[PDB]
Design an enzyme around this catalytic site. Structure first.
Site, PDB file in Angstrom:
ATOM      1  N   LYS A 124     -85.525  15.273  -0.856  1.00  0.00           N
ATOM      2  CA  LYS A 124     -84.342  16.280  -1.454  1.00  0.00           C
ATOM      3  C   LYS A 124     -85.054  17.112  -2.569  1.00  0.00           C
ATOM      4  CE  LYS A 124     -80.989  15.953  -0.770  1.00  0.00           C
ATOM      5  NZ  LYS A 124     -80.051  15.255  -1.811  1.00  0.00           N
ATOM      6  N   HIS A 132     -84.561  19.339 -14.181  1.00  0.00           N
ATOM      7  CA  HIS A 132     -84.730  17.803 -14.107  1.00  0.00           C
ATOM      8  C   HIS A 132     -86.402  17.262 -14.488  1.00  0.00           C
ATOM      9  CE1 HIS A 132     -84.298  13.774 -12.338  1.00  0.00           C
ATOM     10  NE2 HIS A 132     -85.599  13.662 -11.808  1.00  0.00           N
ATOM     11  N   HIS A 135     -86.797  17.882 -18.446  1.00  0.00           N
ATOM     12  CA  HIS A 135     -86.277  16.638 -19.185  1.00  0.00           C
ATOM     13  C   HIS A 135     -86.868  15.319 -18.884  1.00  0.00           C
ATOM     14  CE1 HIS A 135     -83.009  13.725 -19.693  1.00  0.00           C
ATOM     15  NE2 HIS A 135     -82.275  14.629 -20.582  1.00  0.00           N
ATOM     16  N   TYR A 172     -71.881   7.890 -11.510  1.00  0.00           N
ATOM     17  CA  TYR A 172     -71.406   9.070 -10.486  1.00  0.00           C
ATOM     18  C   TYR A 172     -72.350   8.792  -9.526  1.00  0.00           C
ATOM     19  CZ  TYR A 172     -71.781  13.657  -8.266  1.00  0.00           C
ATOM     20  OH  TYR A 172     -72.158  14.443  -7.412  1.00  0.00           O
ATOM     21  N   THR A 193     -70.576  16.942 -15.645  1.00  0.00           N
ATOM     22  CA  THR A 193     -71.326  18.025 -16.458  1.00  0.00           C
ATOM     23  C   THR A 193     -70.716  18.545 -17.560  1.00  0.00           C
ATOM     24  OG1 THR A 193     -71.987  18.533 -13.986  1.00  0.00           O
ATOM     25  CG2 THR A 193     -72.735  20.133 -15.811  1.00  0.00           C
ATOM     26  N   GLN A 196     -71.597  16.176 -20.408  1.00  0.00           N
ATOM     27  CA  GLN A 196     -73.151  16.416 -20.732  1.00  0.00           C
ATOM     28  C   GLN A 196     -73.316  17.518 -21.561  1.00  0.00           C
ATOM     29  OE1 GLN A 196     -73.881  15.973 -16.413  1.00  0.00           O
ATOM     30  NE2 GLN A 196     -75.820  14.880 -17.051  1.00  0.00           N
ATOM     31  N   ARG A 251     -73.842  23.601  -5.433  1.00  0.00           N
ATOM     32  CA  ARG A 251     -73.585  22.209  -5.499  1.00  0.00           C
ATOM     33  C   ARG A 251     -72.383  21.800  -6.026  1.00  0.00           C
ATOM     34  NH1 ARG A 251     -78.511  20.362  -4.782  1.00  0.00           N
ATOM     35  NH2 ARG A 251     -78.084  18.490  -5.102  1.00  0.00           N
TER      36      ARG A 251
HETATM   37  C1  LIG Z   1     -80.861  14.238 -21.299  1.00  0.00           C
HETATM   38  C2  LIG Z   1     -81.435  13.911 -22.651  1.00  0.00           C
HETATM   39  C3  LIG Z   1     -80.937  14.866 -23.445  1.00  0.00           C
HETATM   40  C4  LIG Z   1     -81.178  14.451 -25.221  1.00  0.00           C
HETATM   41  C5  LIG Z   1     -80.364  15.241 -26.163  1.00  0.00           C
HETATM   42  C6  LIG Z   1     -81.134  16.523 -27.169  1.00  0.00           C
HETATM   43  C7  LIG Z   1     -82.001  15.889 -27.960  1.00  0.00           C
HETATM   44  C8  LIG Z   1     -83.318  15.279 -27.417  1.00  0.00           C
HETATM   45  C9  LIG Z   1     -84.407  15.137 -28.753  1.00  0.00           C
HETATM   46  C10 LIG Z   1     -85.622  14.188 -28.068  1.00  0.00           C
HETATM   47  C11 LIG Z   1     -86.686  14.029 -29.208  1.00  0.00           C
HETATM   48  C12 LIG Z   1     -86.272  12.827 -30.153  1.00  0.00           C
HETATM   49  C13 LIG Z   1     -87.379  12.489 -31.049  1.00  0.00           C
HETATM   50  C14 LIG Z   1     -87.169  11.160 -31.781  1.00  0.00           C
HETATM   51  C15 LIG Z   1     -86.380  11.395 -33.052  1.00  0.00           C
HETATM   52  C16 LIG Z   1     -86.415  10.120 -33.617  1.00  0.00           C
HETATM   53  C17 LIG Z   1     -80.174  13.539 -20.431  1.00  0.00           C
HETATM   54  C18 LIG Z   1     -80.431  11.970 -19.944  1.00  0.00           C
HETATM   55  O1  LIG Z   1     -81.174  11.210 -20.708  1.00  0.00           O
HETATM   56  C19 LIG Z   1     -80.468  11.644 -18.526  1.00  0.00           C
HETATM   57  C20 LIG Z   1     -80.190  12.577 -17.459  1.00  0.00           C
HETATM   58  O2  LIG Z   1     -80.333  12.121 -16.285  1.00  0.00           O
HETATM   59  S1  LIG Z   1     -79.650  14.149 -17.856  1.00  0.00           S
HETATM   60  C21 LIG Z   1     -80.562  15.179 -16.370  1.00  0.00           C
HETATM   61  C22 LIG Z   1     -80.327  14.799 -15.004  1.00  0.00           C
HETATM   62  N1  LIG Z   1     -79.562  16.026 -14.229  1.00  0.00           N
HETATM   63  C23 LIG Z   1     -80.373  16.486 -13.237  1.00  0.00           C
HETATM   64  O3  LIG Z   1     -81.238  16.171 -12.589  1.00  0.00           O
HETATM   65  C24 LIG Z   1     -79.653  17.756 -12.621  1.00  0.00           C
HETATM   66  C25 LIG Z   1     -78.537  18.324 -13.271  1.00  0.00           C
HETATM   67  N2  LIG Z   1     -77.261  18.063 -12.914  1.00  0.00           N
HETATM   68  C26 LIG Z   1     -76.374  17.162 -13.774  1.00  0.00           C
HETATM   69  O4  LIG Z   1     -76.826  16.354 -14.554  1.00  0.00           O
HETATM   70  C27 LIG Z   1     -74.871  17.091 -13.069  1.00  0.00           C
HETATM   71  O5  LIG Z   1     -73.800  17.346 -14.108  1.00  0.00           O
HETATM   72  C28 LIG Z   1     -74.847  15.789 -12.232  1.00  0.00           C
HETATM   73  C29 LIG Z   1     -75.043  14.485 -12.951  1.00  0.00           C
HETATM   74  C30 LIG Z   1     -73.099  15.654 -11.766  1.00  0.00           C
HETATM   75  C31 LIG Z   1     -75.748  15.592 -11.007  1.00  0.00           C
HETATM   76  O6  LIG Z   1     -75.299  16.962 -10.231  1.00  0.00           O
HETATM   77  P1  LIG Z   1     -76.433  17.327  -9.007  1.00  0.00           P
HETATM   78  O7  LIG Z   1     -77.802  17.638  -9.438  1.00  0.00           O
HETATM   79  O8  LIG Z   1     -75.818  18.516  -8.119  1.00  0.00           O
HETATM   80  O9  LIG Z   1     -76.508  16.032  -8.119  1.00  0.00           O
HETATM   81  P2  LIG Z   1     -75.637  15.577  -6.766  1.00  0.00           P
HETATM   82  O10 LIG Z   1     -74.459  15.541  -6.712  1.00  0.00           O
HETATM   83  O11 LIG Z   1     -76.109  16.231  -5.440  1.00  0.00           O
HETATM   84  O12 LIG Z   1     -76.093  13.972  -6.641  1.00  0.00           O
HETATM   85  C32 LIG Z   1     -76.004  13.081  -5.596  1.00  0.00           C
HETATM   86  C33 LIG Z   1     -77.248  13.017  -4.755  1.00  0.00           C
HETATM   87  O13 LIG Z   1     -78.120  12.300  -5.489  1.00  0.00           O
HETATM   88  C34 LIG Z   1     -78.650  11.145  -4.660  1.00  0.00           C
HETATM   89  N3  LIG Z   1     -79.124   9.848  -5.551  1.00  0.00           N
HETATM   90  C35 LIG Z   1     -77.890   8.783  -6.127  1.00  0.00           C
HETATM   91  N4  LIG Z   1     -78.660   7.980  -6.926  1.00  0.00           N
HETATM   92  C36 LIG Z   1     -79.764   8.848  -7.245  1.00  0.00           C
HETATM   93  C37 LIG Z   1     -81.121   8.498  -8.032  1.00  0.00           C
HETATM   94  N5  LIG Z   1     -80.873   7.428  -8.910  1.00  0.00           N
HETATM   95  N6  LIG Z   1     -82.048   9.069  -7.809  1.00  0.00           N
HETATM   96  C38 LIG Z   1     -82.152  10.407  -6.959  1.00  0.00           C
HETATM   97  N7  LIG Z   1     -81.141  10.485  -6.254  1.00  0.00           N
HETATM   98  C39 LIG Z   1     -80.005   9.875  -6.257  1.00  0.00           C
HETATM   99  C40 LIG Z   1     -77.089  10.829  -3.851  1.00  0.00           C
HETATM  100  O14 LIG Z   1     -77.596   9.728  -2.754  1.00  0.00           O
HETATM  101  C41 LIG Z   1     -76.972  12.119  -3.476  1.00  0.00           C
HETATM  102  O15 LIG Z   1     -77.782  12.617  -2.364  1.00  0.00           O
HETATM  103  P3  LIG Z   1     -77.428  12.529  -0.862  1.00  0.00           P
HETATM  104  O16 LIG Z   1     -78.552  13.203  -0.218  1.00  0.00           O
HETATM  105  O17 LIG Z   1     -77.022  11.461  -0.418  1.00  0.00           O
HETATM  106  O18 LIG Z   1     -76.408  13.596  -0.868  1.00  0.00           O
END
Ligand SMILES: *[C@H](CCCCCCCCCCCCCCC)CC(=O)[C@@H](*)C(=O)SCCNC(=O)CCNC(=O)[C@H](O)C(C)(C)COP(=O)(O)OP(=O)(O)OC[C@H]1O[C@@H](n2cnc3c(N)ncnc32)[C@H](O)[C@@H]1OP(=O)(O)O
Ligand SMILES: *[C@H](CCCCCCCCCCCCCCC)CC(=O)[C@@H](*)C(=O)SCCNC(=O)CCNC(=O)[C@H](O)C(C)(C)COP(=O)(O)OP(=O)(O)OC[C@H]1O[C@@H](n2cnc3c(N)ncnc32)[C@H](O)[C@@H]1OP(=O)(O)O
Ligand SMILES: CCCCCCC(CCCCCC)(CO[C@H]1O[C@@H](CO)[C@H](O)[C@@H](O)[C@@H]1O)CO[C@H]1O[C@@H](CO)[C@H](O)[C@@H](O)[C@@H]1O
Ligand SMILES: CCCCCCC(CCCCCC)(CO[C@H]1O[C@@H](CO)[C@H](O)[C@@H](O)[C@@H]1O)CO[C@H]1O[C@@H](CO)[C@H](O)[C@@H](O)[C@@H]1O
Ligand SMILES: CCCCCCC(CCCCCC)(CO[C@H]1O[C@@H](CO)[C@H](O)[C@@H](O)[C@@H]1O)CO[C@H]1O[C@@H](CO)[C@H](O)[C@@H](O)[C@@H]1O
Ligand SMILES: CCCCCCC(CCCCCC)(CO[C@H]1O[C@@H](CO)[C@H](O)[C@@H](O)[C@@H]1O)CO[C@H]1O[C@@H](CO)[C@H](O)[C@@H](O)[C@@H]1O
Ligand SMILES: [Cl-]
Ligand SMILES: [Cl-]
Lengths: 254, 256
Positions: A124, A132, A135, A172, A193, A196, A251
């Site tokens: 994928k 991704h 992050h 999800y 989304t 988030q 998507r």
């Molecule tokens: C980020 C953290 C933010 C922190 C805030 C800011 C401050 C930070 C400061 C840090 C420093 C501090 C210092 C210390 C001080 C003391 C968030 C976080 O932590 C976790 C996250 O995951 S966020 C990023 C993830 N997102 C992405 O990768 C892409 C972006 N899209 C989205 O997030 C979307 O909103 C959504 C969640 C809906 C995903 O959408 P999509 O990308 O379009 O995905 P799909 O709908 O295709 O997904 C379905 C397919 O994925 C397959 N699948 C299922 N489980 C998994 C896993 N675990 N891994 C991989 N693939 C998976 C499904 O099978 C399906 O695929 P298929 O081929 O079967 O269709």
């Protein structure tokens, strides 16, 4: 000289001796998911990891519920004002619980690298985006400094909020791993989304208080700037994601 | 370069500084070199210049010029039919579309005149006013606005300019009043309200440009500018929050 300001409580904890072991691990992760992995998978069929993904997503949901509860019981639900909460560096049971929960949150970022490993093994490559990999690389890399210097206080608000949102996000992902037949009932993909995006806005509004609070004795002001800038970087990356995935329909939910 | 320049707006071809991005890069390179290195070196063994009258005249001119550019942005679209949502660039040679393209070019040119702020800091030996926030803003704003006049001189990309010219009327009135002397600076108790106005400006610019990412069927011709405006408004919001923090929260530059 710079390491003389480190919190001695976390000295012996896994990966906390220096930033070097995690830089090697994350260097190998970036190298693998962007170059080595896809090259090895190029002349291979995708791996069937449905059960591994479902178990993994279920574990991350429960682990996120646990970390959220621990952040609430370490300060956020037992006395934190949601304004100038400073780090408690004492060896009291509650202060060590907050430090260990930060360490747990940091460690969970390395477990979440498995997300990208699943993308590579399942071929994928469209899910291995800049958003991704950036992050998943910069979150654990930077959180090493938070556990090392300021494992508590106002800097952990975004982690409390993030563990609560990751309960919805990996539920999800868990439901989507069941197959194309179950993906048709995930019509609320855009609401996740939105959640988030609203999370980055709330994190920015909370950390922005730091710049205006007189006599706030939060011990590491540099983390207010890092948290504020990272939430802006992710808000921009997720708005670009919303734009191509939904506005341009690349998507859309199934 | 030749393939990428085939998408440029032919209406602005003959306009001052619009032939290529090279003349402005040389000018801004000399400006950055002067205000951070050459200027302060030449002023090191010199007494500060007395530029009170030059500052008052300049601030008064910028206030009137900003009122004029704000009025022209209002009469070029914002007060006469723009929806405040998907406002596309009008590339025709109609009087209103050319007036909008003219106003964008004027706004862009005003950024080069505003380089005089930093020249006043250097000549007056106010090196504490030559900060990263100031030089970065004054370099990046004209440099990037060349591409806006060259490719998309109108539409939703100009909202931040309409708002910025209106705020610069308040900002340079503050600068004009403070240039009058220490006697007049004691009545500028509202300094923090001006910084709040600047912060609220970046928030409104970000909220307006964020609509682009959600609008289906929006035919705004240069999506890359939505990303630039949003990222710049976030960069300035962070720089101005750091400014608020050291100037007011830590009291380094409190009102007099
Ligand atoms: C980020 C953290 C933010 C922190 C805030 C800011 C401050 C930070 C400061 C840090 C420093 C501090 C210092 C210390 C001080 C003391 C968030 C976080 O932590 C976790 C996250 O995951 S966020 C990023 C993830 N997102 C992405 O990768 C892409 C972006 N899209 C989205 O997030 C979307 O909103 C959504 C969640 C809906 C995903 O959408 P999509 O990308 O379009 O995905 P799909 O709908 O295709 O997904 C379905 C397919 O994925 C397959 N699948 C299922 N489980 C998994 C896993 N675990 N891994 C991989 N693939 C998976 C499904 O099978 C399906 O695929 P298929 O081929 O079967 O269709
Ligand atoms: C930035 C633009 C934002 C745009 C929106 C974001 C998106 C943009 C996307 C762009 C790309 C698009 C692509 C194309 C699309 C189609 C704002 C802007 O435009 C103009 C500005 O000036 S903002 C930055 C200026 N600020 C600073 O330099 C420092 C920050 N501080 C402030 O802003 C403060 O809020 C305040 C205005 C109050 C000034 O605070 P201060 O720095 O603390 O200043 P002082 O109170 O000391 O100043 C008084 C002293 O200054 C002397 N003086 C008076 N007049 C002048 C002038 N003109 N020059 C120099 N010095 C001056 C006074 O005499 C006094 O000194 P004295 O020694 O006499 O006491
Ligand atoms: C983890 C987050 C998602 C949970 C989804 C819960 C699940 C499916 C369970 C199976 C999931 C796949 C393994 C339970 O919902 C079921 O619950 C039954 C209880 O016995 C009800 O009798 C049944 O009618 C209901 O649909 C569906 O929920 C919703 O479905 C809506 C119609 O799309 C319903 O209008 C809504 O109200 C319901 O809430
Ligand atoms: C423990 C047993 C749980 C079964 C639940 C089945 C599930 C949810 C599936 C979720 C899948 C997980 C990702 C299918 O639900 C969907 O089924 C579609 C047909 O395929 C329909 O087109 C759709 O509108 C419906 O919501 C919900 O079904 C029921 O929900 C009831 C509300 O209590 C409704 O009154 C009922 O009548 C509906 O049927
Ligand atoms: C930020 C986005 C959060 C999304 C939360 C949605 C969530 C979890 C709430 O789910 C709850 O919904 C309750 C009804 O309101 C039920 O009583 C409860 O059993 C269920 O768990 C799942 O609900 C949806 O599940 C769909 C099948 O995947 C259903 O087709 C849909 O129609 C339902 O809406
Ligand atoms: C080269 C000289 C001889 C050809 C004349 C071409 C014609 C007039 C066509 C009239 C209709 C004929 C059926 C195209 O003119 C128009 O063409 C439009 C579409 O591209 C442009 O958007 C518009 O700006 C331009 O004026 C005018 O050419 C020049 O006009 C300049 C402004 O007087 C332009 O700055 C310049 O670049 C252009 O070369
Ligand atoms: Cl993306
Ligand atoms: Cl500053």
């Amino acid at each position: 000289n710079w390491i003389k300001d480190a919190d001695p409580r976390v000295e012996d904890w896994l990966l906390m001796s220096s930033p070097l072991p995690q830089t090697i691990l994350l260097g190998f992760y970036v190298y693998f998911v962007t170059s080595l992995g896809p090259k090895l998978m190029e002349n291979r069929k995708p791996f069937e990891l449905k059960k591994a993904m479902i178990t993994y997503n279920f574990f991350i949901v429960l682990f996120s519920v646990y970390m959220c509860y621990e952040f609430v019981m370490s300060g956020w639900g037992i006395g934190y004002s949601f304004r100038c909460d400073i780090v408690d560096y004492s060896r009291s049971p509650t202060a060590l619980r907050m430090a260990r929960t930060c360490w747990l949150y940091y460690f969970s970022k390395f477990i979440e690298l498995l997300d990208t490993i699943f993308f590579v093994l399942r071929k994928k490559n469209s899910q291995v985006t800049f958003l991704h990999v950036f992050h998943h690389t910069i979150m654990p890399w930077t959180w090493w400094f938070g556990v090392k210097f300021a494992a508590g206080g106002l800097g952990t608000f975004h982690a409390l909020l993030n563990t609560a949102v990751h309960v919805v996000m990996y539920s999800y992902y868990g439901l989507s791993a069941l197959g194309p037949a179950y993906q048709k009932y995930l019509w609320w993909k855009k609401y996740l989304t939105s959640l988030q995006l609203v999370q980055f806005v709330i994190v920015a509004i909370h950390i922005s208080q730091f710049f205006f609070m007189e006599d706030c004795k939060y011990q590491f002001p540099v983390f207010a700037c890092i948290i504020m800038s990272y939430s802006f970087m992710f808000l921009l990356l997720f708005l670009h994601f919303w734009y191509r995935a939904y506005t341009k329909g690349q998507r859309l939910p199934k």
